[model samples]
Target: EMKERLGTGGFGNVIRWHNQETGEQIAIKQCRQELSPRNRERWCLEIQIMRRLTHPNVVAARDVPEGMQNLAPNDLPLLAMEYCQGGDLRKYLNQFENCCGLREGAILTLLSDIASALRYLHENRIIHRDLKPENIVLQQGEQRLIHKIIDLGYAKELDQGELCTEFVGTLQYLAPELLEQQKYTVTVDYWSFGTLAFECITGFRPFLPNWQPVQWHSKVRQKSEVDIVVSEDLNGTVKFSSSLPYPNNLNSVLAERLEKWLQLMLMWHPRTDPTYGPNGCFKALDDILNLKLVHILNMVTGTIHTYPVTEDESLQSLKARIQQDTGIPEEDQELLQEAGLALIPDKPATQCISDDMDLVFLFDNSKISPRPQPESVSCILQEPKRNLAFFQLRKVWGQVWHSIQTLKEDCNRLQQGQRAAMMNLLRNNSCLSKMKNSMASMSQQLKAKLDFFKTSIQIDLEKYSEQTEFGITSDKLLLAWREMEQAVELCGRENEVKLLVERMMALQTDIVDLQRSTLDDLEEQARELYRRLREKPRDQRTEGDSQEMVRLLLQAIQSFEKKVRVIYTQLSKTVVCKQKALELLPKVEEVVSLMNEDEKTVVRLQEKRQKELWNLLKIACSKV
Candidate 1:
């Protein structure tokens, strides 16, 4: 009876078939396409080739059921082989728990099993060209997992002294020489083995899994580490220094060994396959590595529990030891190292559990804090019209900032004027003090002489020939004294200088106050706008707040613009008014200078009149 279909490929389907006579379940591979005459002979040849393989780790071809018709020798034959229930390595590796990579122990078991399988094939002078996770199937034997290499469609017998020229096998695991246009040798299997080990240690393949074959060929050819130039006779082999990118979380000692082994096997190094030795029959190094799996800790419980590690221990066995001590069942124990994923069962246990790792365990598959459902972009943003206004606010702020700076620039100009005027007065003070003190002394001296002359005139007015002329002289002297007093009032003094400087200082302070108020109001606007921008709907309940916030943002932006205009208006008024006052100041200097010139020139008349009065009194004295 044919049961469920096992799998399907390019050749055809593999169905779970039952043998009627032996009453044993078997896997029957049925090819759909008709083979060429030469390919048909090769297909039959593969059956005989597979029949001779009897290793436990390899899936062997069995005799056709006694009652069933055998389609061999004349046409392409159907394959009757062993059944694997645990599925292929692709399924095993693709499982969610095996995402990062297989446990070190699982990889050890895998390598060990595959190594045995390939060694058997190689001993018989056969090379299984296609070796990948898909071709390696899992068999559950007595509740234990076992890996078995399947499919020999690409297997070739090298004993016939033939080199296969076809580009064969999966592109990810395809050997270098197969794409380089060279006829490939049995050493290509070693390349596949090295690549498979890398995949087993890391969840994914070395290159991007989805890359096309042409791109993959370029990737394989351009690793750059290997450079070969042949000046020797053509028979001498070209050596390469290829390297494998090993995983960081792996057991470094083991991974390091594998890397060197990979370097040899992956490149065109002859006799570099681990299954063979240089002298042909000599034993190659067999041990990968064995690190004591220590520091096994419970993850969920937050504690460490010591456990034994050995050369042949598997991850599941360690989990058993952990379960027995922690009163947990093996089913509940999910063990993992520091590789950022689970340590799956089936590999040999010794290398999987790292010494530095906690061997993290989780009894239950759950987490706290319920995951929030993802919402659409509409929830986070304000409504369309409001959002557009808010976006427009960004543009408005740019202009508002420039206006504020313009106000600031005007303030700076006012201050600069104030400082420059003050500095001019300070420099002029050096002569100002001297002029004021000397002018005070000169005024006192002139006053004393005038008093003396007036008294002399009073004493000698009767001595003049005409008394009316003396009276007129006295009137002229009094009028000249009044003009002298007016002249002194117009002259510059230190105290009057202080009045101009003091008024300028006060104007500067008012300008500063106006700037502070304007900047301070704009600062408030900036903070409110930023707060509104940060506002988002935490949920549907608060979504309306965003709409309101967006509206308010525009109001706030416009309010800021109004305030900026107000500040600019105030600054403009202050500048023009102060500028008018400043205009009066320059005029005040012009008035002082013109009056001072008049004081100097017109003061000469006072002295001349006083002298004439004295001369008239002298004439009267001579007549007397």
Candidate 2:
């Protein structure tokens, strides 16, 4: 039977098929009508490129069934493609929640697939002339979230020393070289990738956020190389006449790298020549692939295992991926030592990692259990009662304040004690200096007698004391005293710790109260959520309500946690002591962990609902 049009275009429309007799399904991509000679050649070329490229990211082209041969088009072509249930990337990003764009983890993962896909195409001497979100589709896979590049209608395979001169890509993603009618290498595709990245990470493309092709057609060519700049001289690096607006989700440093990446991709590079000379520092495909794979060394076994990575995720995220890869639970993985202690917990990967970076991980089996991968997607109702988790997650946010307060106070008090102890010891040592001087005078008198002594048996001990090598100077000791004096003077500023700890201590109480009260109400509201999720099937009717329940809960928790972290960072810079506070660190660790565990559960619910929402959107999508 004819199916919902998965997508529509000038040459063809992608539709799904459910064969009742064989109990199988396939996506039908059949040419809709007759077209010009030029248009027909492009469609034929698209068919050829897709058939040749067998990659996970590039959708696989399939041969028609023998039974359907009679219905297939004679002049043009009728084809079938791998069914992608998740639908187009354009539709996925268009979800109301995705107003701003994707999370860092999602973007980086997307980067991996798309980059690999492009590299495969380019290396094979083909260029996907038009690469846009609409041309990318998503399908749930046995292993992970599967992103496939679909509909290479404008793609072309070039001969050696040949450049693609077609002015065919969608204008927003079109490289400037194309608009200028200049023959381009694979760098044009690189430009398209950068545009996709900018559009996906932020809601808008780099140049004109408006994205009306009529305006963008001229806006791209008007700017010269000087306007769109990438300076290679700044080894580790912005003022501009006109520039690409950066994503706020990325930090100053991470954002900087993205800008430079976009610039090199969209602008000029040394390796523009397909066969460029050495100094491959900023080469296009290699630079993007630079973020692909990394090797993690098991400190205990000395076995180095290579694993794929996405930029800008926490070390814990890598642990999750490792857990999926190695069957070790996240709690059991103790990973560290990226560039020597640089791989800190909760810090983004973009801040630290380079390609093939080595990481140290050790297994801690104290609490080993199987933890499923976070990349799970479900089409139907999952366990309802389990979705009730994370209601009390916010309560643990109170402990974050405690961890900071306790650590800050502990360090400060310990330093204070050391300062006092140093002063007391110095005071006690100084009183004995007069006796030392008297002893020195008596020693000098004895030294004069040693010179007169001739017999070896009567050799004086004072002569040995007078020996330069035998005696020590008090210069370093005096310096130590001076340093102690300076330190004690500064250590008396307890107000820094006082102000910081006071703020945190107050915030802890606030979190406790809000969480206890809010979680109670959350459970009440969550009932409304579970009731909808328990419907046991895909239909858009209930998902809207499910989204609000999560949206409300997540907003409140995030708002509360955001304030707590904001305050924590205010103290993060002013790095404290308490004997009791130090003892509370164990509780602090558990509470912080409790928060994260609860967060994971919440994430599951969020993704679960979003998963269901996608089901709704998928139908709503193809309707367009």
Candidate 3:
């Protein structure tokens, strides 16, 4: 017999067993004793629920003897499933210090696979209410971390044919919505995804026994809390695993990254609506990724450095002073002249301290001499002159912009390549396909913002050209440039979003292409096997042999078709909103530029037109 007993659970003992007559190895699960009629009914329903799952990552109950019933209270029916050479996922994971000290790349790859499986269950309207390492079984190698999700005792199938509303699964992994017994959906599985990711990275779940289900709900509500939820503080004591364990496996850097992700997942946002809300699962992921990328970019470039807003200056005056302090060079002077402008420095710096020292300037009394603030109203109307040392500041801005432009182009090219890869992957993986589809919309939103910034640049170019006609004031033009920049955030939020879409798109394309290529090879092999089956002697030929071949062929076809569907879906959702915006925004620019307005009205209309363009982009995304 190939069957062998591994161990048992509260529901039943998991045995290693084999059908000696058939010579096949499998896991045979026997349900635990049920004295209550309610438990008996649940046992029956579990068998029914287990039958419908045909996914490679999900185990289906099979090989049970016919006419078997729980006639006696202790009569445990057997549920056989594909035998996993390796044991339970928890034990396998425990072998690694943190996933057995798996490499960082391996950890991320495992997370992707896990996310893929979770997505499948969610899409089918099934919830593995209790997802923990205990219910999973590993195969081997890097994929050993990816287990077939077993233990369907608490699996909730929300079909009209059978809907189970009962609270199930471990309290720690249960979602806040589940703890409250509210109408929950597949999103609950995503909550488990967070928990599982935490455990995989840290060799432990963030929320343990003491924190419980109720406490997490409170933590979720408060939003003031910063600490990771734990039942009891380990403090100095460290619990260790082979490949992974606490402190060592859960390093500060990874923990902080995970924490940032959890913050978004826990807090419900009102503006984004349900699908884009906190519970949307992947939405928080996007935010975390964007925030991290921005943080990284700031670190690499000294974007965090602030310039102090000194006194007797409006925001406009401050910008003009900074521009002058940074010195407009000879080439720039010609450019500015063409645009009808010359740089003038504002003197008599006064400090405007906010809650913090956000911006600071180098102390140089020589270049910038102290002067008395003029009391006369006419003094306020006049623009001050520039300092000689302002040349250094202009040099710095030039260097900063040069580096940023270089990086931006690199990022753009990398993103384009990634988008191409995602397109290929979409042909085979629906989960990646859906992610790519959503990204298409998100990219449109980002492109709209990017286009607005481009428009601001164009307006500056045009305004610079009109200097002679308007007798342009440096003070006024500087104010307008600053205002235009309001539409462009320094955080690179829109750029990061666009980059993510590209990465995901590229990933999707690569995966689907690989899967199809693999499937085509498999189909060829299957055909060869079918030919061999037909060529076999009559006595050797059996119905089982033909049935097996047919099953293999059917599965190959299904996989192939699924990949094709994803590619189709991705293409369908790729709305060219940004391209449309490029066409339309310039027209809006023509209208807004020609309108007569006070300087204030000019700024207001600039904002209004950008907003209107963004709204139009949203509409375009929806149309796709």
Candidate 4:
């Protein structure tokens, strides 16, 4: 029996209902008969569409009451769907109460679930034309919250390589391709996803454009271009006018990455002559899915880093990156809640921290003082040799050297065959002289830079191998240490010796830290560059060889440029360390000389003190 009206839509009114047989709650949608025949067909289509889908994230449809099961073709059937107790996303957003947005973890979980459902629909050749907050239902489970997508009223079946000509779905969520009356793919769902996500993050939709009804109707009717109002962020990524208050709670790196992902969805453009491949949304979805198992965060710095963890990785594993970023130990790090600022449990960060949620790291200031740990004699000795420092510099140099050689060969191969083919085309069509000249200049400039970079790498690689330039020698360091060791053993010089050792140990620690940081940065740069290269658009293949070569050259140089930057950074650190090492040499020599003189002076002073004590003792006895 209908207890109360839930909501109303164009087709019908939804009512809250309880099943007498099962004693369960449900929602019954009943359409009006007074509507035109076309609307009646649409109402029937929605029911059929819902009936075909069966997924955990998708809303399940049930049979109408027995009395209403059999109906005329034009008569509406009583439709029922699973009743969601948690309400829709709109209500959930309202319930946020104080926070500007939900936790990152919660948002990712929502997006992951939504994306999974969308992928299933697109795979089945169904376009979810009406994806919005109101159409989505939040279902509460005993273990976790589940979101189910409802309201398939505007869903459409798509044929492979076929175009959907109708102007359907909500205006705000419409993709540019759809509004422009151009053929679109499943990517349209991604645009809607972006709009929904932006609203979820910032409490408002991004750039709500207005298109007048009269203007829209005429554009659709006349098959003319629609002059809709456009509102976009001046920067590519969406920025809120009012700063989101959760800046401290949000991991900036994750936030930035999320922003970039949203931009791809919101500002997507399907190439007019796109190559046959998977939709852009599919790739983005795959990336989002992979992030679910990872635990990532950041310190006060704006960049957030994600740390991947396996089931076996202990809670302590979360502290490794944090310890590296901030010189604080994991023991001192305190995780706090965003809402109440309360302490979190001592559990694995992956298990305890909700998806995308940023908690404050309250470090114990007392324990955070930079106290240098004493290293073993062997470890201290090895630091002076600078083996790791030399090795890492060589490793990066080799990488650049290898890349330069490979690039040269690739460029040569392109010139041998691909370049001629492009030239032949230009020669046959003299009208392309202007374009050819432009390409030629770009090629010449590219060659000049490549040659210059290659020469630089070769010189550096050669210089690295020379014994003279390899300044740190184990023999010299050991001799210096031996002199200091002998001096420390002399009477009354332990304090000075300990001070020298501590300072030297600190310097050694700095070298190791620099080496590790340099290598990590280089690895990250290389990984991203390769990922980008692999992600290059396939459509570029059809754009002609000259343009392709130019793009290839640009990417290669960019890769080289990144490598060079890493090299320069390493060199700068090495130079600073070398200067400190040089200063230590003279200081240690002076310490040995001063300690030798102090030993002789101490013996002479001790004899004088003993004689004076004897004289005083004799004079006291005579007086008594």
Candidate 5:
């Protein structure tokens, strides 16, 4: 048999080999040492789990061969299973520049399939605590779309055991709660899955460099003490390293698809939005977690009221156990299991309830839930003649923000100046009386206008910041929409697909100018105010109010600064979404155009890839 050794982890060594008896290829995990008493029990539990569970995406435990020779010190148990010539996901991915010759569609399929398998694993009260690209196996040849999960070394048998508090699993993929040594739920597996997916796309772990195991653990412990949010166990399939920040760019499908996938995997946070409620959202991990927790807890506390085993364990055994334990009611315990709250160990049963039930609970129950809706951009443009109207609005808002910041600084400077002037005037009483009245009126007027500007711009920026909402500024919203709309419009125009791409240069130029102009203006005004304040009389300046005013001024600047940052993030994401849609648009369009090329009029992509051609020939029709 052809045999090759793969890498090893704490659990055991993995080797690729063919099954001599059946002429089948398989991977063998030979334990180097006898499992600790605890590991041995877990090993047995994992085997029991494999026997009861069957899934295309999951790695199956095919052989134990009771008498199989133990080679390790004290002869620990060994597991032999199917071998995949395509190798582990990470190695395979490394072999190919772009996911090792994998197509986008295939990658999506693989991800979806794995998610389905994980969904099954979670539903069955099992948790694959150690999930990484290394665990994923690709079948050889046949375009190799068929992938099987391999290695149960770190798989945890969650249904029958106490939630483990000891840390386990790979450090890079470890969930925050696990690192903190909390007794967590299946959510940890979901977290690893997310990190794995991230690495698959980006070729880097999210929390690296700063992710040295020891340092990472200390950071996790500190955060754990705050509120113990347990985000990993929220039943959401998606879990990110808490230390990681939301990517400034959610534009790329490969990179930012996590956000959408996360929504699909877990319920919206409580802060999402009330209008969405339970029915409108997608199924989330949070909901699944709550369900799993309740189901598992029912098994522990007897809240589910399980019945006689139509499948798996009988109610009598469950009831006897429940009677022995007193945490929950026997009736509720039976009810929960009967309701399919505790999934049977056999092939997963059809879902007993709507998928949304789990989704709604996570999203609705969480801290933040902002419901997003489709937006209309038509209202922003009354006519083509007003093409620059949106740009003008941005300019106006910028001016308002600038004036407010300038006014605030001027107020502070004037306060200092007047105090110093009064001190000087104390030498001449008449001078003080003449200057006081006029200065008071001037300061009041400027302050009033500045406050008005601050409130107006703050509200205006907030409104425009969301593409779904209309506001006075058009740069952010219009730019995002224009890019999105153009991408959607070229369905069958393969011949002119390249033409659409050429337009990006011009659009990008406009965007850059807008960003530069906006940033420069704000910086200039802020500096000018700081300069004016510094020139005020030295004796009149009290460090407290001066510092406080500077702080508030900085805060005000940061308010818009943060908003602009958000807009920049959104804009970057919009660019990615647009580019992704644009790249695929042509390939799909080519096939359609080829099928229809015999028409009375036909055009080719290589030539005349221009907006003028599109306009003159009326070829560019919007799809959205």
Candidate 6:
């Protein structure tokens, strides 16, 4: 059965068709044959482009039926394609207008889909010239809606050294380069993507004249839109827009990142020669998709600040902003973890911070730097009882006990963190029952070990206190010395690996710098040589010096090439050294294993000493 018509375009009418037999529905584009040959050619090209593009976010085109082929003048060429029920993105946005804007998560998902489709097209040397809200259709599903791009009439196959000269596509979605009629590449699609994304979120395009320089300047001076523009183009022109005024339930950090992404996309540097820009579709997609929102609070004022930040942003940057707002410098401020109250370093905040989690910033009034050093533990065992060198034995026991306790605590913390991570990951899954059972069994084993140390081990120590005239055995002394040697070895190996890693990183940096500078100089010389080679022919190039110049020019390339190979060899050697160092590094697991062995040895030695004391007490009683 033929349903109602979907939409119409310049060269065709889109009609909805339903099949009763298989219950299949499709949208068919009917290109009127009455149109000019050029129009028909473009229509056919779109069909070809659509046939080649098969992405989840791109509409799939079915083959034109033979009955519709070779049509008469009055007939039309029918092209069947996948039908979208939720309609175009423009309508989708209109539906959500009452809500001010779509959720950040939804916006991210939509933009990701669009970016994926564009990347596919760009990779295949195709450009979607007319990317806009109307061209993006939503296919409603049971769980979620998928965004698929349609309408490829203005799309063109572009490659390096090629320019799309013809002015096509709607004016609103046109990139600056397209508007200026300059040679453009796939980056134009990136521009349109930004524009469409901006419209999707703010309900309007950013670069419209209505958003004039005056409003932006005011916002900039007020620090409201201070972080908007990421870069200026070659013409020294920057595109920036104030943050959206509407307040929704959206996370502040997400909004900031979203705005940052749009600014990058809208930005361009006009130049004679150009490479990929930071806002290029691929880079922007990668950065934006990984962003997470975080909440920060000033404990003193009870003030909360929430913003979106990527894991890559240094905690130092967050501190700088806090200083700007609260007059608390980075040195005076400390960011504490939510659960453990552990102070987080300025390395990377994403490692500790999570969405809606409060990051506590404590201000220390004393200007002195607060660095937490390990607490010094000193236990003096100088009192020797009877004939035994009890001081030395007790010292050895103290160290062993301390190490075991530290290892036990570390194991517990590690176990708890791992279990929590596994639980969070499997919380919504039906397989959580199995995970729970496994976790329960592990918990029982851990409890048994803890109970033995806390109860049974302490009672054994009490029984040994009554026997004083004891001497250290050779086996006990040897075991303690061996444990001490292992600890020293572990520390030495750890330090060695750290130094090796540092050296490897420095070597890599040098290699990059050398390659960049050396290759650039060599390339220039090669270019000059080729230019002279072309200027002089074999018949006219007979100067003695000129002939020598040719040999030196050719030899230079091989010389530079050999040097590069040698450099790579050096890099390989450094890599090998680093790998070997890592392999030789002492592992925490091995240290724990040795500690467990030492524990068993100590327990056995203690029992032997207690038995000897019992025998001595019986002999003293008989003498009395």
Give Cα-based local distance difference scores for all models. Answer: 0.51, 0.48, 0.44, 0.49, 0.42, 0.50
Better of 3 and 5 by lDDT: 3
In angstroms, the error of model 6 at 34 is 3.3
Model 2 Cα displacement at 24 (Å)? 3.1
List residue ranges in candidate 6 displaced over 4 A.
4-10, 64-76, 96-103, 141-143, 159-170, 180-183, 209-251, 254-260, 267-279, 296-304, 307-624
Ranking by lDDT: 1, 6, 4, 2, 3, 5
Model with the higher TM-score, candidate 4 or 6: 4
Model 6 lDDT at residue 185: 65
List per-candidate RMSD values in Å.
33.6, 28.0, 29.3, 28.3, 32.2, 29.5
Worst 10 residues of 5 by lDDT: 358-367
Give candidate 6's total backbone clashes: 3
**Which candidate ranks first by TM-score, i.e. highest?**
2
Residue range 1-624, candidate 6, lDDT tens digits:
456544345245566766545666776776644566665555666666667659787878866542434333544456677776665777776542212345345776688888888888887888776677777877776666778776665677773222123443345665656555556666677668876777666544545423343354343333323223222222234444355423222455666655656666653333111234443577656665776756665533434566566656777677787788767777867555434344456467575554334554556541111121121222121112112232222222222222223233323332233233223323322242223222333323332343454344355445446746453333343354334433322322223223433544453343234322133343344345434533557654333222333333345444444543443344333334333333433342243334334443444354543365666567658877
Q: Over the stretch 217-275, how does candidate 2's per-residue lDDT look in tens digits?
A: 55544545534422111111112333444322433234555555555555533424333
lDDT of 3 by residue, 328-428 (tens): 32222211111112223443223223111122222111111111211111111111312222212221212222222223332333233224433433332
lDDT of candidate 1 at residue 20, scale 0 to 100: 68
Q: Spell out the clash pairs found in candidate 1.
A: 105-347, 106-347, 313-349, 314-349
* Runs in model 5 lying further than 4 Å from the true structure: 5-7, 19-22, 64-78, 99-106, 141-144, 162-170, 208-210, 217-624
Q: Distance (Å) between predicted and true CA of 511, model 2?
A: 18
Ranking by TM-score: 2, 4, 6, 1, 3, 5
Best by lDDT: 1
lDDT of 1 by residue, 1-624 (tens): 677654334244567778766768787666546556665555566666767757867887777665665533435667777776666788776653343455345776777678778878787888876677787877777555667766656667786432223454455675667556567776778767766776676554553344577865565465445321111112222223233332223453455555555445555436364355541111332434333545554433334455546777766677777777666678866454443345656677655544333444445432221111111122222234333332333222222322333334323432333233233333333354334423333333333443544454445544454555535534644555445444444443433434544564454454445533344355345445434443434442222223444444345445544544444454344444444344545543543444344444554454664576667778668976
Q: What residue runs in model 4 are displaced by over 4 Å at the alpha carbon?
A: 3-7, 20-22, 34-39, 68-74, 96-99, 159-170, 180-182, 209-249, 268-277, 292-324, 327-624
